[PDB]
C-alpha cells in the first residue's frame, strides 16, 4: 500500500494590502498538520505528527516555514506589481507539495502550483518551470524565482531529502492510526421508486456495496461518492432504480476489511 504525503497551501489576495495563507497536511486520507493564518506555529492534528524528528529538528523546520509564509506573501504582492495592469486582484494561489512513498526506500517528490484554480507552475529538478497550457506572461515570474539560488537549493533539499525521510518516520509513528479498522453500519431507505443503501463509519476507504436479490448481483446499482465523516471515517450510499411492488426480496450486501468475512446482509 502506497502512501501519498500532501502539503496543501491556499493563499488569497483580495487587493494590494489584504492577504491570508492557510495550510493543511495529509498522509493518505488522514490529516496530520494544520496551519491557520491566525496561528504563528504549525499545529499537530495527530499525536504522532512530529514523526521521528527531534525537537531541535522540528523547531528549525517550522522556523523555515514561518519565514517562508511572510516571504511568500510579500513576493506574490511584488510579482503582481511586475505585471500590472496585466494581472489583477482577487488572486488565488494554491500549492500542492510532498512525496509519494513506494516499497523499499523509493519515492517521488512533487511541488505543484495553481493560479486562479489552474495548474501552471511546478518545481522540477533544480528550477521552477511552467507546464503545458500556462500563459506566457508567467515566464517573467519564473525567471525571477529561478534567479534566487538560495530558494532553489532549499526546495531541492526539502523535496529530495527531507520529505522522504519525514514520511518514513510518520509511517512508523502513525502505524497504529494508519492501519486502523472501523466497522461500517448500514441502513435502508426509499425515495419516489429509488432504494438507497447507506453505509457509514468504515475505515479504510476501500469498500464493496451492491444491491442483490439472493445470489444475483443487480447491474443497475449506482455507487455515490465517498463522503467523509467528522471522526475520520467514510460514508457511501448505493442507489437502485426499481418498479413499485418488487421491493421485497432485495438485499444490500456490504463487504469490508474490518468485518473479517462476516458481510453485512440487510434485507428489506
Amino acid at each position, epitope marked *: 500500500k502506497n502512501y501519498t504525503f500532501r502539503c496543501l497551501q491556499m493563499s488569497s489576495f483580495a487587493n494590494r494590502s489584504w492577504s491570508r495563507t492557510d495550510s493543511v497536511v495529509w498522509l493518505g486520507d488522514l490529516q496530520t498538520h494544520r496551519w491557520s493564518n491566525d496561528s504563528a506555529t504549525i499545529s499537530f492534528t495527530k499525536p504522532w505528527s512530529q514523526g521521528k524528528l527531534s525537537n531541535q529538528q522540528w523547531e528549525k523546520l517550522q522556523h523555515m516555514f514561518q*519565514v517562508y509564509r*511572510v*516571504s511568500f506573501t*510579500r*513576493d506574490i504582492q*511584488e*510579482l503582481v*506589481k*511586475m505585471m*500590472s495592469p496585466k494581472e489583477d486582484y482577487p488572486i488565488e494561489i494554491q500549492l500542492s507539495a510532498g512525496c509519494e512513498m513506494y516499497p523499499g526506500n523509493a519515492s517521488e517528490s512533487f511541488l505543484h502550483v495553481a493560479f486562479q484554480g489552474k495548474y501552471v507552475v511546478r518545481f522540477w529538478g533544480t528550477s521552477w518551470q511552467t507546464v503545458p497550457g500556462a500563459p506566457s506572461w508567467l515566464d517573467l515570474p519564473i*525567471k*525571477v*524565482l*529561478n*534567479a*534566487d*539560488q*538560495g*530558494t532553489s537549493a532549499t526546495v531541492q533539499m526539502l523535496l529530495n531529502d527531507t520529505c522522504p525521510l519525514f514520511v518514513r518516520g510518520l509511517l512508523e509513528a502513525g502505524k497504529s492510526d494508519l492501519e486502523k479498522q472501523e466497522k461500517p453500519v448500514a441502513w435502508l431507505s426509499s425515495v419516489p421508486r429509488q432504494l438507497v443503501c447507506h453505509v457509514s463509519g468504515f475505515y479504510p476507504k476501500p469498500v464493496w456495496v451492491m444491491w442483490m436479490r439472493g445470489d444475483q448481483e443487480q447491474q443497475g446499482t449506482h455507487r455515490g461518492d465517498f463522503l467523509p465523516n467528522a471522526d475520520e471515517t467514510w460514508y457511501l450510499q448505493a442507489t437502485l432504480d426499481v418498479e413499485a411492488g418488487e421491493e421485497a426480496g432485495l438485499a444490500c450486501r456490504v463487504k469490508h476489511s474490518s468485518l473479517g468475512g462476516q458481510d453485512i446482509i440487510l434485507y428489506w
Partner: T-cell receptor
C-alpha cells in the same frame, strides 16, 4: 553595467519644481530611487519594474515617480521643501539581487 | 533600523589595522554587502558575503559573516590615507529582484597619514 544621473548638483527654492533624472542603458527592467541623510542609511523612495509603472517605496511622501521608457526613471518634486535637502541615489537591476548604483545627486532646497 | 553598525566614527594611524562591525535583524538574510563611500563620491562595492559561515578578501580588505549570530566584520589590513571614507553595511532579504536592501547608517573612518 553603468548608471548615470542628471543633474549631479541642484540648488532650488521652496515650492519650485525639481526633476531628478536617471539613465541606464543596460536593458534592466527594474530601477530604484534612494535618498541618503546623515544618521540614516539609504531609504527607498520610489521604484519601478517596467515602463509606465511606478511603485511606492518606504518614504514616498512629497515625491512622484515617472518611467516613460526602459532606460529613463525620473524622480519629480512638484512642491520642493527644505526637508528634501539630501543626496539622491538612483539604482538599476535585472532579475538578480544586485542593484547597480549611480553617482548620486546633491540637492539643496532654500527658503 | 534593522541594520546597526559599530563604531560610529573611527580615527586610526597609517599602517594600523582596524575592524568594522555590522549587526542586523533582517529576516531572511540572503547576502551582506560592504560599500565604500568617499566624502562626496558614490558607493563602491568592496565585497559580498553569501554563505552561512562566509569569508571573503579583496586585497587589503577582508570580511566574515555569521548568519547564526547575524553579524559581520570588515577588516582593513595596513590602512592607507585613501581609506578615509564612510563604510556602509547592506543586507538583502532575497536572492533576486524581489529583495529589499537594508542599509546601515555607516562607519566613518579617518586615517591619519
Amino acid at each position: 553595467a553603468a548608471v548615470t544621473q542628471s543633474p549631479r548638483n541642484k540648488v532650488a527654492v521652496t515650492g519650485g519644481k525639481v526633476t531628478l533624472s536617471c539613465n541606464q542603458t543596460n536593458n534592466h527592467n527594474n530601477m530604484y530611487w534612494y535618498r541618503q541623510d546623515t544618521g540614516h542609511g539609504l531609504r527607498l523612495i520610489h521604484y519601478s519594474y517596467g515602463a509606465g509603472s511606478t511603485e511606492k517605496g518606504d518614504i514616498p511622501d512629497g515625491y512622484k515617480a515617472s518611467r516613460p521608457s526602459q532606460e529613463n526613471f525620473s524622480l519629480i518634486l512638484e512642491l520642493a521643501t527644505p526637508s528634501q535637502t539630501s543626496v539622491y541615489f538612483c539604482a538599476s537591476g535585472d532579475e538578480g539581487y544586485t542593484q547597480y548604483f549611480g553617482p548620486g545627486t546633491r540637492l539643496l532646497v532654500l527658503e | 533600523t534593522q541594520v546597526e553598525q559599530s563604531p560610529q566614527s573611527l580615527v586610526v594611524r597609517q599602517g594600523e589595522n582596524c575592524v568594522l562591525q555590522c549587526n542586523y535583524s533582517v529576516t531572511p538574510d540572503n547576502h551582506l554587502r560592504w560599500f565604500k563611500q568617499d566624502t562626496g563620491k558614490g558607493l563602491v562595492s568592496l565585497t559580498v558575503l553569501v554563505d552561512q559561515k562566509d569569508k571573503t578578501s579583496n586585497g587589503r580588505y577582508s570580511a566574515t559573516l555569521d548568519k547564526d549570530a547575524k553579524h559581520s566584520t570588515l577588516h582593513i589590513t595596513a590602512t592607507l590615507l585613501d581609506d578615509t571614507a564612510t563604510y556602509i553595511c547592506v543586507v538583502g532579504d532575497r536572492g533576486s529582484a524581489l529583495g529589499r536592501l537594508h542599509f546601515g547608517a555607516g562607519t566613518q573612518l579617518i586615517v591619519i597619514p
